[PDB]
Write an enzyme that holds these catalytic residues in place. Structure first.
Site, PDB file in Angstrom:
ATOM      1  N   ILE A  43      -8.558   1.694   9.331  1.00 16.47           N
ATOM      2  CA  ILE A  43      -9.130   2.493  10.452  1.00 16.47           C
ATOM      3  C   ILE A  43     -10.670   2.423  10.459  1.00 16.47           C
ATOM      4  CG2 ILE A  43      -9.372   4.872   9.318  1.00 16.47           C
ATOM      5  CD1 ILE A  43      -7.647   5.705  12.024  1.00 16.47           C
ATOM      6  N   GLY A  44     -11.232   1.762   9.456  1.00 15.64           N
ATOM      7  CA  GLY A  44     -12.665   1.702   9.254  1.00 15.64           C
ATOM      8  C   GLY A  44     -13.109   0.586   8.297  1.00 15.64           C
ATOM      9  N   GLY A  45     -12.188  -0.298   7.913  1.00 15.63           N
ATOM     10  CA  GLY A  45     -12.539  -1.405   7.055  1.00 15.63           C
ATOM     11  C   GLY A  45     -11.650  -1.552   5.858  1.00 15.63           C
ATOM     12  N   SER A  46     -10.604  -0.732   5.811  1.00 15.40           N
ATOM     13  CA  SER A  46      -9.737  -0.584   4.641  1.00 15.40           C
ATOM     14  C   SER A  46      -8.777  -1.749   4.337  1.00 15.40           C
ATOM     15  CB  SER A  46      -8.931   0.706   4.765  1.00 15.40           C
ATOM     16  OG  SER A  46      -9.698   1.833   4.431  1.00 15.40           O
ATOM     17  N   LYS A  88       0.835  -1.207   0.000  1.00 19.76           N
ATOM     18  CA  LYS A  88       0.000   0.000   0.000  1.00 19.76           C
ATOM     19  C   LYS A  88       0.867   1.252   0.000  1.00 19.76           C
ATOM     20  CE  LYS A  88      -4.075   1.893   2.268  1.00 19.76           C
ATOM     21  NZ  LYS A  88      -5.142   1.447   3.151  1.00 19.76           N
ATOM     22  N   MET A  90      -7.296   8.687   1.580  1.00 14.89           N
ATOM     23  CA  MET A  90      -7.582   7.381   2.186  1.00 14.89           C
ATOM     24  C   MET A  90      -8.910   7.217   2.916  1.00 14.89           C
ATOM     25  SD  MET A  90      -4.091   5.608   3.235  1.00 14.89           S
ATOM     26  CE  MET A  90      -3.897   6.621   4.843  1.00 14.89           C
ATOM     27  N   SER A 132      -9.498   1.276   1.687  1.00 15.27           N
ATOM     28  CA  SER A 132      -8.557   2.119   0.992  1.00 15.27           C
ATOM     29  C   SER A 132      -7.258   1.436   0.538  1.00 15.27           C
ATOM     30  CB  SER A 132      -8.257   3.358   1.813  1.00 15.27           C
ATOM     31  OG  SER A 132      -7.384   3.080   2.861  1.00 15.27           O
ATOM     32  N   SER A 133      -7.098   0.147   0.868  1.00 19.68           N
ATOM     33  CA  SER A 133      -6.088  -0.691   0.196  1.00 19.68           C
ATOM     34  C   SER A 133      -6.645  -1.368  -1.070  1.00 19.68           C
ATOM     35  CB  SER A 133      -5.450  -1.727   1.146  1.00 19.68           C
ATOM     36  OG  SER A 133      -5.302  -1.240   2.459  1.00 19.68           O
TER      37      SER A 133
HETATM   38  P1  LIG Z   1      -9.989   2.697   5.693  1.00 14.32           P
HETATM   39  O1  LIG Z   1      -9.632   2.056   7.095  1.00 14.32           O
HETATM   40  C1  LIG Z   1     -11.694   3.199   5.919  1.00 14.32           C
HETATM   41  C2  LIG Z   1     -12.228   3.931   4.726  1.00 14.32           C
HETATM   42  C3  LIG Z   1     -13.122   5.052   5.222  1.00 14.32           C
HETATM   43  C4  LIG Z   1     -14.601   4.662   5.180  1.00 14.32           C
HETATM   44  C5  LIG Z   1     -15.266   5.472   4.077  1.00 14.32           C
HETATM   45  C6  LIG Z   1     -16.017   6.572   4.299  1.00 14.32           C
HETATM   46  C7  LIG Z   1     -16.319   7.094   5.690  1.00 14.32           C
HETATM   47  C8  LIG Z   1     -15.602   8.403   5.915  1.00 14.32           C
HETATM   48  C9  LIG Z   1     -15.974   9.258   6.880  1.00 14.32           C
HETATM   49  C10 LIG Z   1     -17.128   8.978   7.823  1.00 14.32           C
HETATM   50  C11 LIG Z   1     -16.614   8.958   9.242  1.00 14.32           C
HETATM   51  C12 LIG Z   1     -17.206   8.261  10.212  1.00 14.32           C
HETATM   52  C13 LIG Z   1     -18.433   7.399   9.994  1.00 14.32           C
HETATM   53  C14 LIG Z   1     -18.164   6.066  10.649  1.00 14.32           C
HETATM   54  C15 LIG Z   1     -19.097   5.301  11.238  1.00 14.32           C
HETATM   55  C16 LIG Z   1     -20.544   5.710  11.376  1.00 14.32           C
HETATM   56  C17 LIG Z   1     -21.440   5.085  10.302  1.00 14.32           C
HETATM   57  C18 LIG Z   1     -22.460   6.122   9.780  1.00 14.32           C
HETATM   58  C19 LIG Z   1     -23.283   6.773  10.913  1.00 14.32           C
HETATM   59  C20 LIG Z   1     -23.396   8.268  10.754  1.00 14.32           C
HETATM   60  O2  LIG Z   1      -8.983   3.929   5.391  1.00 14.32           O
HETATM   61  C21 LIG Z   1      -7.704   4.063   6.060  1.00 14.32           C
END
Ligand SMILES: *[P@](=O)(CCCC/C=C\C/C=C\C/C=C\C/C=C\CCCCC)OC
Ligand SMILES: *[P@](=O)(CCCC/C=C\C/C=C\C/C=C\C/C=C\CCCCC)OC
Lengths: 537, 537
Positions: free
Chosen positions: B202-205, B106, B155, B181-182
């Site tokens: 950090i969120g599923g990437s 990455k 990302m 994002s990978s």
């Molecule tokens: P990867 O680990 C994660 C990719 C980022 C996910 C894509 C879009 C979300 C971006 C911003 C939203 C921020 C927080 C929302 C999170 C959880 C709540 C669910 C919705 C409820 C409002 O990249 C390194």
């Protein structure tokens, strides 16, 4: 409502009566048992005598409980007596590595059906529902927690004194602070009423009492042990790391406490703590050491006692085959003034000041409460009015400005980067371990409150989250107390004047020395302490 | 000014012509050798045939460089060729646990004399001074890092595209996202261009590109592996944990990489990582497990493909003798809306917006940049006006309101407490591991930008900092796309509406399950991942 500190004073009086009426119910029934040579046994000999059944668990509990009672008459260190012992004695597991051993608790380790007041009328209401995690494991390891010990008011003090329970004294000298914030622990383990005890540390609270009362103490890496029932008074601050850990009469006991603690019960009751065992091979090593040292941090001037301590154990370590290397971590002023102090006071102190609504403010705390309550515009005005004259003080007031979440994020990054840069400096010189002067002879009474700059030496390794340990090495001779008249610190500001008058009149008082290793190397750290103890004592 | 995207477009076209000339100058000098049986060798056999000396280092590098050149013409997954390999082929350590193995990084894993532009114009000037710590230990274990792979713009996306290197496609269907994002890593490892790569999450990437492209992948606990030279766009964020981790074709390759990572070299280059070894005897274990399961989180509705896969892989584990228990994390809407979303956006976007100053914002990022740029008052107004109609979108706008440092400590504590409660939930049902739906068939192209709700399945485990793992279990039947017309969300807001259109037209594309253990229990997570692979595939 806070006039109910009288309500805490009678609870304390009652618990002390309950101690006294259980040890006269024991010393009458057991008229022939040797009291003094029970208490002067080292812990390693004590636990071995227990496991080998030469002593009953009852004999060693009650001899300590008497001795706890006896020295609390002097010191005022004991907060309450933890009543569901004796039934803890009856069902104590034999194969546990601390089977006989009674432990003293800092008040903040929550214990079921007992108050974890921090000194605060806020928390004088409600007893805890459950025993905290490290207490749970000490009990599964055969230990018998027996007392809560006193703290300063919000735990944010290296004195020990408290509106709810009173002042704690140093067992060596009455005009002197026992250290803080585990000052109750420190007063009780010095003078011999406890073999083992637990404290917390975020600016030096395991190491202040250890060094003031002449005992041994270790502050591990913040996530080595579990915090899962720790009563604090602010929560969620994660830049400058909180640690709990052991306090004892010898470094060998700190090693025992830690090895008892680092077990499969702990890693299961709290899986956020990494399952890292006590690495016995790294502790029991006799391979020679690359040892970093410094004489001073260029911030708090050492006392002549601190300096004599440091230089003497430097020499003895060289004579025993260890190579001793000049080393000072970079940007000490930046680490203390912006990272440490600004990490602690990131919110302006609003979260902390909410504990103090409707409370008395203890004289040991100094003016810190008055200054945190001052408007933010006035904090900043004072800050830049002082900057041409007393820059330490200027920076102190600037750290107390309330920040944003954006500005905390920048601070939390600056901290991880700084930790990386001391790690690169450490590896460049190929160290294993580093030697530091620990803050010198116990400061007077309500004087830790007025000498905030003297936490410089300890607060550094909380900011870094390095394991730090204290081991006492010498005591103040009548020329170390004479050269205090020729003291003037690096800054000549108000903090140095208070420190000059606070550190005087302390002949025969213990001085210590700080032993630091790298993160998660606390058994390497204990190994270095064992070496420092053996060479000096 | 950002118009020097065209400085990187030529850098990409140069690196793509150096790969082509080198694979030709090898294949002309080596015409008789088999590609299609080199490539389709599973990693375990590939390293053991590299260790024995049946295959050459050069026969596996220049074959795999070959496949990566071919697949890139249909995916645009590759960004740069990591030139100072071949010297990494000539001087690879011979007994390194991945001695032959070429690895794909990455973009953000920084590499000496190359850039980590995160798809940003800001980062395009300056190449990195040093190899990051995990790249270092890969090279110390005989691995050959050979390609940087494409990312979405800042990302913060689960599509993959940016205004520097353009759009990256799914190998299975050209109208679909690879994930992200990978996304460059998933598109490369699917379709056979790489045996192994590292991503971040950090969120599923790590998990999105795993599940969409039909490969395997694990997000370890945040501090299992070092982050020492990882490039981000926001630094200092500690509520909701970033982790890096392996991505590969089978779960044995993930465990191989994890065990190669977890060595005394890694715990030395970076002492902040707890020196926790890869416990083989927990991974290799075959004792039946108590497995928590849920079919939905009641927040994002499953695709009929998703629901099918979960219940199918439930039944099989029951037929192998594992005991499958109904289990749902308490208060999921609270942890998504306030804890995670709030935790990511607690500065209001300010730090994150500084990377877009003068930049093109990419059409796959949707309106995120347009909404974060909106001033505080309008965000708050639009929040309380949408809350009767569309609660999710309101809570989303309520999470981008800029907090104080006081209000961040509160949130950090709520996070550390929420963890404790899901842990207590897990241990009162006595679970070993958990089985969880994974966000179904791949979404279309510029569509993850307007389906932010759909990260709910993955982001909960960044909030909790629990091991999570993706393993493919089925592909989409014509019946799964048939019942996809009957999909209505739990809200029917704009996120659920986009989710129907983006998940349609997906017959033949893979679908995966998610595998969760307690903090630090990676090898057990992978052990459960092995079984779910071993049954279904
Ligand atoms: P990867 O680990 C994660 C990719 C980022 C996910 C894509 C879009 C979300 C971006 C911003 C939203 C921020 C927080 C929302 C999170 C959880 C709540 C669910 C919705 C409820 C409002 O990249 C390194
Ligand atoms: P223990 O770990 C620590 C006892 C607290 C130390 C006593 C007073 C300091 C209190 C507040 C000052 C905050 C930050 C100052 C720190 C470092 C900077 C040094 C002075 C430069 C301005 O209790 C759990």
């Amino acid at each position: 409502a806070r006039g109910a500190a009288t309500r805490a004073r009678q609870k304390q009086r009652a618990s002390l009566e309950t101690m006294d009426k259980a040890v006269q119910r024991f010393r009458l029934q057991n008229p022939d048992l040797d009291s003094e040579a029970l208490l002067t046994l080292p812990l390693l000999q004590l636990v071995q005598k227990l496991q080998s059944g030469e002593l009953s668990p009852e004999a060693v509990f009650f001899t300590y409980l008497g001795k706890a009672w006896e020295v609390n008459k002097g010191t005022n260190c004991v907060t309450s007596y933890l009543t569901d012992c004796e039934t803890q004695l009856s069902q104590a597991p034999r194969q546990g590595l601390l089977y006989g051993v009674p432990v003293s608790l800092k008040e903040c380790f929550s214990y079921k059906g007992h108050d974890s007041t921090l000194g605060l009328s806020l928390n004088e209401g409600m007893p805890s529902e459950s025993d905290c995690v490290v207490v749970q494991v000490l009990k599964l390891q055969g230990a018998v927690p027996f007392v809560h010990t006193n703290v300063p008011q919000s735990m944010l003090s290296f004195d020990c004194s408290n509106p709810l329970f009173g002042q704690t004294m140093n067992p060596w000298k009455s005009s002197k602070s026992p250290g803080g914030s585990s000052g109750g622990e420190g007063a009780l383990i010095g003078s011999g009423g406890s073999p083992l005890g637990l404290g917390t540390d975020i600016g030096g609270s395991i190491r202040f009492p250890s060094a003031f009362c002449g005992i041994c103490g270790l502050k591990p890496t913040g996530n080595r042990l579990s915090k899962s029932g720790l009563k604090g008074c602010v929560y969620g601050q994660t830049a400058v790391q909180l640690s709990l850990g052991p306090m004892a009469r010898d470094v060998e006991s700190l090693a025992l406490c830690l090895k008892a603690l680092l077990c499969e019960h702990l890693f299961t009751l709290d899986p956020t703590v990494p399952p890292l065992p006590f690495r016995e091979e790294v502790y029991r090593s006799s391979r020679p050491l690359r040892v970093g040292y410094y004489e001073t941090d260029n911030y708090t001037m050492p006392s002549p006692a601190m300096r004599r301590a440091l230089i003497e154990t430097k020499q003895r370590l060289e004579a025993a085959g260890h190579t001793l290397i000049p080393f000072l971590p970079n940007n000490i002023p930046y680490a203390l003034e912006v990272l440490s102090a600004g990490g602690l006071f990131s919110d302006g102190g609003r979260s902390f000041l909410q504990n103090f609504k409707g409370d008395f403010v203890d004289p040991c705390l100094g003016d810190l409460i008055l200054i945190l309550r001052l408007p933010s515009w006035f904090k900043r005005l004072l800050s830049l009015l002082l900057k041409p004259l007393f820059p330490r003080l200027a920076a102190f007031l600037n750290s107390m400005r309330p920040r944003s979440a954006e500005k905390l994020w920048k601070l939390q990054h600056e901290i991880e980067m700084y930790r990386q840069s001391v790690i690169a400096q450490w590896k460049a010189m190929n160290l294993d371990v580093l030697l530091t002067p620990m803050l010198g002879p116990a400061l007077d009474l309500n004087t830790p409150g007025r000498a905030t700059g003297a936490i410089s030496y300890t607060v550094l390794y909380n900011c870094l989250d390095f394991p730090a340990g204290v081991v006492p090495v010498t005591t103040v001779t009548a020329e170390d107390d004479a050269q205090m008249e020729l003291y003037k610190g690096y800054f000549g500001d108000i903090w140095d004047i208070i420190l000059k008058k606070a550190m005087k009149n302390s002949v025969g008082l213990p001085v210590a020395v700080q032993c630091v290793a790298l993160p998660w190397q606390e058994e390497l750290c204990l190994r270095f302490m064992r070496e420092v103890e053996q060479l000096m004592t």
